[PDB]
Design a protein around this ligand. Structure first.
Ligand code: A1CMV
Ligand code: CLR
Ligand code: CLR
Ligand code: VSN
Lengths: 226, 286, 55, 335
């Protein structure tokens, strides 16, 4: 009543269904990490420590039996709006900020004040309608650069309203403190900070802890508790 | 006269609230939400075990409302079997929900690839199978006896009734009380420690309030299980040890201790479905 | 430097023949009414020839 | 200097368009019978995707379609009996477009990987193997439509469309002129012209042979997310984000119809026309699909039943199906 062609079609679609199911089960354990950051931030440096096309750059690395996928968007330069909803469920963001550009003036704008531009980028990523529940990790990359930059230069170029110290520790604490309150929704969204510059597996350990915390939150949401 | 009225009334009210809870839970978990997640599968299995377990309450109410039990013998066998089967499976799924939550919180990497719907399905059908592994001897040893001019449902053993009764009472006291309590306390205590030590529940007033109410509902579940399962086991152990004289107070206390387990079985749907926020969202849409 | 090529592109777009909106909309309406019998969406065909039916 | 000349030439174009407009489409269609309260039911519920679908394309045989979702799987769907003929593992997990050739021997996919992959369907070994890897865009691909079996036209994020020769992998024509990110293109029924829409709310029609841009239509406000020709090839309709679908004319060069509602504030991400052309179905963003009578600008039906955004929409070439995709891994076909 069905002959060989319908049996072949049924078996073909069954085999396609098993392949799709096993591929979706395999990729359900993957952790999505939307790496961000403007130019000369330190993204190329922090993708050099994970040793273990025109637009999107894909790198894969596993750590302690958990799989990470990294979606660098540095190639794409048209509109973040028209493909930022294409992620929609990334585990964590790996946003980077250079700390040495507190006093830097752009050579093409002459008034852009690069650190404030990073503030607008971080505020746009944090206060996005598509990214309102995901954790956002800060990798303030350049430590030694602004260390021997503030060894001689003041810190009131970026924040004239700030004068508590001129040394590394209080300046770094102040800029992280005023950077983490960019988050207008801290009730159910958490922002971490590592400060980078270890030449070790410390950045990997930091994103491992952040990812496991996000997975704990997801399991709480699945368990009908949180 | 009045005491039989109150015993029948408490069995009837416990049975009707049990069927109402474990049927409204069924209706919601079938029509509004589905069994996609592992927790929904576990809640559905718990609803099955609790609904079929408390259905035997009218049988005991006509066992002691006014006298004899003319229902039959094979009916007695299947009633004893489904009671000792479904309460056992309800206890087992109550344990494996706790093990699932401890796995979810304390081991997130393993909880990614362990809390699949297929794994939950095979685990709880294995739980029903392991309950059946002791439910078949229950069906084998069930019988109907005619003594004192009345019909009653005893449980016949072999010729040494003392030894078989001792082993069965130890097996139902250890594998249904002291093993659920120990595993549930260890798992939930480790879960509460990991929930206190996490970043998302600390550093703010609202997050600490959420942690406190999560610990509060965990304590409510464990405390309800303890307060509704301790007195019946102590009652049966000390009535096995010493000769308790028969009196009205003994009858009332014995029926309270029997009804406490069914009170646990009827409080499980309101403590495991209405407490979860997914069913709260399901109720909020209507 | 794109202002010049924008000007040439715009002036090439300007000098084209444009018919009246009434005639073109009448042509669109005529094409709609001339294929009304070939559209199963507007006029639902009976189930004897519908290719999507239950098993 | 020259900017004033450009502005006055735009003013002259606008004045000529207003003088060329003497009757709107709605005024002369008041005497035609409406299609009433049209109702369609989901005959097939295609399932098997495990991510967010973004594009689907029908076939000329009106039986096989293709669907592209975010999991990197390209599923070839048989609509009649709900079967999966093929599954293509894409190297790129990010796709916003997928193409199905009129010959049916080639299926294309593309997206944020800046590469227009072309897959061979009718190989001798039976399996689906990639044939030619197109490259040359510096932005995200967003639309690809097969002109014929050897020529494909694509739009991308580098503000330029492109006509391609498949056997050489080169752009024979680059359609520069968009001051914004072009996202959707549709080809004419006679496969000699095509019109696209960009983020600058402009609808620029082109020529395949020589590449010149003929007309532009800037009636919209936010952007253009979708586009689809009329069956006669003398009109098209455009999606947007300002809750408006607008019909545009090739010969008169104006805006004809405004498919807008008072309570609708969401965007439009897909438009397609029926075989007759009187029915324009738009995949909105308020978790439903809409029916727009293309000659009356009124809502005649609703293709609800979607729990997420209706990203893609396609009406088959013989009027026997309306297959719409959505963000919740479902494709459904209406009749
Ligand atoms: C007392 N203990 C130690 C139990 O473990 C018990 C079993 C008691 N069982 C109940 C039904 C019964 O009354 C009956 C007699 C005749 C008929 Cl026709 C029908 C039913 C005979 C006695 C239990 C404790 C508390 C509440 C309910 C049950 C139990 C719990 C869990 C798993 C297995 C067994
Ligand atoms: C094997 C013999 C001894 C006893 C059989 C009873 C057990 C194994 C049966 C009875 C009722 C059954 C359940 C009925 C319905 C469902 C819902 C479905 O979505 C998943 C399986 C599940 C949850 C079944 C699992 C198996 C089940 C618990
Ligand atoms: C968890 C809370 C309720 C504490 C647990 C209390 C337990 C241990 C109590 C509650 C009811 C009690 C019984 C109530 C009545 C009688 C009858 C009497 O002639 C002998 C003692 C005996 C048989 C009691 C034994 C102890 C008992 C089972
Ligand atoms: N001395 C010193 N150099 C640093 C530090 N952090 C980053 N760099 C340099 O910064 C460039 C990456 O920027 P890049 O252009 O690839 O970014 P991108 O957004 O395009 S990926 C690399 O050459 C780095 O040596 C630091 O602490 N100290």
């Amino acid at each position: 009543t069905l002959s060989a062609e319908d049996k072949a079609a049924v078996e073909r679609s069954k085999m396609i269904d098993r392949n799709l199911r096993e591929d979706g089960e395999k990729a359900a354990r993957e952790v999505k990490l939307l790496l961000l950051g403007a130019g000369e931030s330190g993204k190329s440096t922090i993708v050099k420590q994970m040793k273990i096309t025109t637009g999107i750059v894909e790198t894969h690395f596993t750590f302690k039996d958990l799989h990470f996928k990294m979606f660098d968007v540095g190639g794409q330069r048209s509109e973040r709006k028209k493909w930022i909803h294409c992620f929609e469920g990334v585990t964590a963001i790996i946003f980077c900020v250079a700390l040495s550009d507190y006093d830097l003036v752009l050579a093409e704008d002459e008034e852009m004040n690069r650190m404030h531009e990073s503030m607008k980028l971080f505020d746009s990523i944090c206060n996005n309608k598509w990214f309102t529940d995901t954790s956002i990790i800060l990798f303030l990359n350049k430590k030694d650069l602004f260390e021997e930059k503030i060894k001689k230069s003041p810190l009131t170029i970026c924040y004239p309203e700030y004068a508590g110290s001129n040394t590394y520790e209080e300046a770094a604490a102040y800029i992280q403190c005023q950077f983490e309150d960019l988050n207008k929704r801290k009730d159910t969204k958490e922002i971490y900070t590592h400060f980078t510059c270890a030449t070790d597996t410390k950045n990997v350990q930091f994103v491992f802890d952040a990812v496991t915390d996000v997975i704990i939150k997801n399991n709480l949401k699945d368990c009908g508790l949180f | 006269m009045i005491t039989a009225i109150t015993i029948m009334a408490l069995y009837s009210i416990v049975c009707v609230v049990g069927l109402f809870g474990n049927f409204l839970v069924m209706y919601v978990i079938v029509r509004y939400t589905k069994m996609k997640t592992a927790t929904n599968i576990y809640i559905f299995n718990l609803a099955l075990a609790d609904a079929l377990a408390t259905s035997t309450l009218p049988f005991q109410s006509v066992n002691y409302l006014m006298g004899t039990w003319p229902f039959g013998t094979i009916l007695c066998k299947i009633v004893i079997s489904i009671d000792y089967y479904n309460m056992f499976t309800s206890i087992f799924t109550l344990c494996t929900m706790s093990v699932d939550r401890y796995i979810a919180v304390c081991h997130p990497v393993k909880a990614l690839d362990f809390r699949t719907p297929r794994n939950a399905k095979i685990i709880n059908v294995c739980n029903w199978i392991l309950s059946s592994a002791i439910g078949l001897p229950v069906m084998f040893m069930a019988t109907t006896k005619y003594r004192q001019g009345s019909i009653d449902c005893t449980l016949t053993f072999s010729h040494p009734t003392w030894y078989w009764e001792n082993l069965l009472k130890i097996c139902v006291f250890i594998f249904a009380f002291i093993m659920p309590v120990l595993i549930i306390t260890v798992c939930y205590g480790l879960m509460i420690l990991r929930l206190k030590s996490v970043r998302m529940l600390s550093g703010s007033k609202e997050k600490d309030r959420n942690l406190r109410r999560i610990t509060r509902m965990v304590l409510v579940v464990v405390a309800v299980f303890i307060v509704c399962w301790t007195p019946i086991h102590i009652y049966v152990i000390i009535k096995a040890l010493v000769t308790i004289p028969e009196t009205t107070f003994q009858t009332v206390s014995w029926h309270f201790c029997i009804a406490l387990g069914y009170t646990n079985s009827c409080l499980n749907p309101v403590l495991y479905a209405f407490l979860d926020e997914n069913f709260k969202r399901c109720f909020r849409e209507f | 430097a794109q202002a010049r090529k924008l000007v040439e592109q715009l002036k090439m777009e300007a000098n084209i023949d444009r018919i009246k909106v009434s005639k073109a909309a009448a042509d669109l309406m005529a094409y709609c009414e001339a294929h009304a019998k070939e559209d199963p969406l507007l006029t639902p065909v009976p189930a004897s020839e519908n290719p999507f039916r239950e098993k | 200097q020259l900017r004033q000349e450009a502005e006055q030439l735009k003013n002259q174009i606008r004045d000529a368009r207003k003088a060329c407009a003497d009757a709107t489409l709605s005024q002369i269609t008041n005497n035609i019978d409406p299609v009433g309260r049209i109702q369609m039911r989901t005959r097939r519920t295609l399932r098997g995707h495990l991510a967010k679908i973004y594009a689907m394309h029908w076939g000329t045989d009106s039986r096989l379609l293709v669907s592209a979702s975010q999991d990197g799987k390209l599923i070839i769907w048989d609509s009649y009996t709900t079967n999966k003929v093929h599954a293509i593992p894409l190297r790129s997990s990010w796709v916003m477009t997928c193409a199905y050739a009129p010959s049916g021997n080639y299926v294309a996919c593309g997206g944020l990987d800046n590469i227009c992959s072309i897959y061979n369907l009718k190989t001798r070994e039976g399996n689906v193997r990639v044939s030619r890897e197109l490259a040359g865009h510096t932005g995200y691909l967003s639309c690809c439509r097969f002109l014929d079996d050897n020529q494909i036209v694509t739009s991308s994020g580098d503000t330029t469309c492109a006509l391609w020769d498949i056997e050489t992998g080169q752009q024979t024509t680059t359609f520069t002129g968009h001051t914004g990110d072009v996202m959707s293109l549709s080809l004419a029924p006679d496969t000699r012209l095509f019109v696209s829409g960009a983020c600058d709310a402009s609808a620029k029609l082109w020529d395949v042979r020589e590449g010149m841009c003929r007309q532009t239509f800037t009636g919209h406000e936010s952007d253009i997310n979708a586009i689809c020709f009329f069956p006669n090839g003398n009109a098209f309709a455009t999606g947007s984000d300002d809750a408006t679908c607008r019909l545009f004319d090739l010969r008169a060069d104006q805006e004809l119809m405004t498919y807008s509602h008072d309570n609708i504030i969401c965007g439009i991400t897909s438009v397609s026309f029926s075989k007759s052309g009187r029915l324009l179905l738009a995949g909105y963003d308020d978790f439903n699909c809409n029916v727009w009578d293309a000659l009356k600008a009124d809502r005649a039906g609703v293709l609800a039943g979607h729990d997420n955004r209706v990203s893609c929409l396609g009406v088959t070439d013989d009027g026997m199906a309306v297959a719409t995709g959505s963000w919740d891994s479902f494709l459904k076909i209406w009749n």
